Design an enzyme around this catalytic site. Sequence first.
Site, short mmCIF file in Angstrom:
data_model
loop_
_atom_site.label_atom_id
_atom_site.label_comp_id
_atom_site.label_asym_id
_atom_site.label_seq_id
_atom_site.Cartn_x
_atom_site.Cartn_y
_atom_site.Cartn_z
N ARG A 31 -4.10 5.96 1.22
CA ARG A 31 -4.45 6.93 1.95
C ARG A 31 -3.64 7.83 2.83
NH1 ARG A 31 -9.21 8.31 2.11
NH2 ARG A 31 -9.14 8.52 4.43
N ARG B 262 -8.31 9.97 -5.55
CA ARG B 262 -9.31 9.24 -5.21
C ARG B 262 -10.64 9.77 -5.38
NH1 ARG B 262 -10.37 6.44 -6.64
NH2 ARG B 262 -9.16 4.08 -7.24
N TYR C 276 -13.29 -13.33 1.12
CA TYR C 276 -14.35 -12.29 0.81
C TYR C 276 -15.36 -12.78 0.12
CZ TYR C 276 -10.31 -9.03 2.10
OH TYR C 276 -9.66 -8.06 2.62
N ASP D 209 -7.10 -3.17 -6.47
CA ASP D 209 -7.90 -3.97 -5.50
C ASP D 209 -7.82 -5.26 -5.57
OD1 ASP D 209 -11.02 -3.63 -3.54
OD2 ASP D 209 -9.30 -4.66 -3.20
N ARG E 262 0.75 -1.20 0.07
CA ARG E 262 -0.09 0.03 0.03
C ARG E 262 0.73 1.25 0.09
NH1 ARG E 262 -3.43 -3.39 4.13
NH2 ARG E 262 -2.80 -1.49 5.68
#
Lengths: 356, 356
Positions: free
Chosen positions: A31, A40, A154, A76, A27
Amino acid sequence: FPELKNDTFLRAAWGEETDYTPVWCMRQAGRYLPEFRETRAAQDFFSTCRSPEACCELTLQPLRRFPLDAAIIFSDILVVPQALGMEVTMVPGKGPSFPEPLREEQDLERLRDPEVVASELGYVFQAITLTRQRLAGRVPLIGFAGAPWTLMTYMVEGGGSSTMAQAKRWLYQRPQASHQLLRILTDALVPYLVGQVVAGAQALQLYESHAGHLGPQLFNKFALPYIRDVAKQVKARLREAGLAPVPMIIFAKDGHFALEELAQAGYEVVGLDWTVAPKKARECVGKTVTLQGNLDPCALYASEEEIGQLVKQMLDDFGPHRYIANLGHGLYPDMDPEHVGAFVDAVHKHSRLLRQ
Amino acid sequence: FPELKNDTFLRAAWGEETDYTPVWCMRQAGRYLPEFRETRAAQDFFSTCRSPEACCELTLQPLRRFPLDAAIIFSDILVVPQALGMEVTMVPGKGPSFPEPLREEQDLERLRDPEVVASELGYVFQAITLTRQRLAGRVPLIGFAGAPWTLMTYMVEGGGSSTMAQAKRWLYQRPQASHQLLRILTDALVPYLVGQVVAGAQALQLYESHAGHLGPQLFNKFALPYIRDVAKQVKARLREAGLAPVPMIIFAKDGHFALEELAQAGYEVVGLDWTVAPKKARECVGKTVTLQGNLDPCALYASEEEIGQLVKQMLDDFGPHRYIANLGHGLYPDMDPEHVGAFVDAVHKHSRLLRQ
């Protein structure tokens, strides 16, 4: 495709000696970067993502900030289940989400045939080629996917979960359906990864972020054999395709009990989280795989001076050869970019100071 | 206090040989029991809990169902921070919750002096005495608390959390405040545990359910030294008090990297989660501590016949001596009580079949 200037990361990956220790972060495009959030803001998360120009931009943002030794493509791990035909929603600023998870075996009918998936992920292939071009040989570019079991969790659990209970319930109550799903995931992953490399990726990372939830016995029945195929089949297809194989990396979060086999699953690099002591790992894997990791991401909350020392300590433990420095999991969104800078500098400064 | 009939668990704990393998489960008094929920319905969770007659009832419910080899007192690890003066809320059927967590160092002023806490937890002491009386010597009774670091994480993080980021931020940015909080927790725990034993507890369990989030380095700075004091000081106070010491158990969830020291932290038993292979653990701890664990709780979702075999396998790995069987974490609320029955029977049936 442009000729690579800095290739320290690739040579470290293959086991070849190097003048300093390469470094990057999971990552690294995230963010914690303000510029990340102002880009974003451009659209809803999954078409951004679907816009090649946008992924490229994100992928590059950290590289403009820090002398990182690789770039990893921004994506992702949910794209794959999504390409398989599972609908995602972006629920009240809380992240990834399948509103209708797989629950009974029949549900599997909902999924696309694995072979066509590659064609649904054309935006990614495109973003890779775009990005391989614009790095213009500065550093190598890592493609990536999530490992079959992880994606399974998931798809079955829907969101994230502390226990993976719904998913493990499947393992214990529906071994066949489970095997069936996992296979579908593997057969989807292979053409997606080959794709990435054909599209210009130079290294590939597999994320088994939910290894921890399985123990030895489960893990060998349901994670390992699939982790192994992906590596196997991807290496083959590349050969048939007259393409050079790329270094592969398995990252099993919390997979200390698995290190031994992961070292013989036929990956070139094995990723460590911060809970495995570096020496213990070297032991478990022996001396012909390269290790990557494993600073505790939270360590970045420390002073820059404290950061340096912890890094120095980590380096001493891993030693000169067969090692790519990295954190134990991805960066957190409230980290200070100046401390990431510190982390990156310290590896470089200290890995040299270690040799010379 | 009545003389104990079955004491297999205590003798197993101390390392003494036994005719079969004792067994019990974390959260054996839990929502997987229907009768548990029809008695939870009696009031809001924390006065129920505050009613001695109610805890006793819950504590006993599983023992009426299954030949378990110990009873553990029904409580929540949140009672301690609560006794320290932190307000809990029961938010929309999602569980434990501090609406106002500790965030800055000043916050610590909010807390009670650790020595008075014991007196705020009089309902527990009472519930223990009540329950020790009503088991009437059938099996021994385990008291319990959560370990300093674990409680710290709840106090700082408020709820539960995937990363423990707020809390680890404290470790890295406020070592002193952190040390200070941890000490307060230790000084609270000791008189609470002594209390439990004075009140009639025969074994004590410490839960370090958030071990995993620390690595080696953090864990030795901030978890170990406190895990060690609790054991130390509790053993002392009991001696000064002319009371016999009880066997102590440390359970570090995901603490594989810590097993070595936990074996010399001066606990009699060391709890394992299902991610540590049993043989690897025996190795790490050597031969003078007893191990407890470690079936994956999800394993109970299997057929009863599958359950039996997995258990057989677990037993072979741990071998006859120095071993208390148990799951890797507490039971889950959707488990079938008939499969817990299966688990309990299989230990007994197979541990005998193992010896004879």
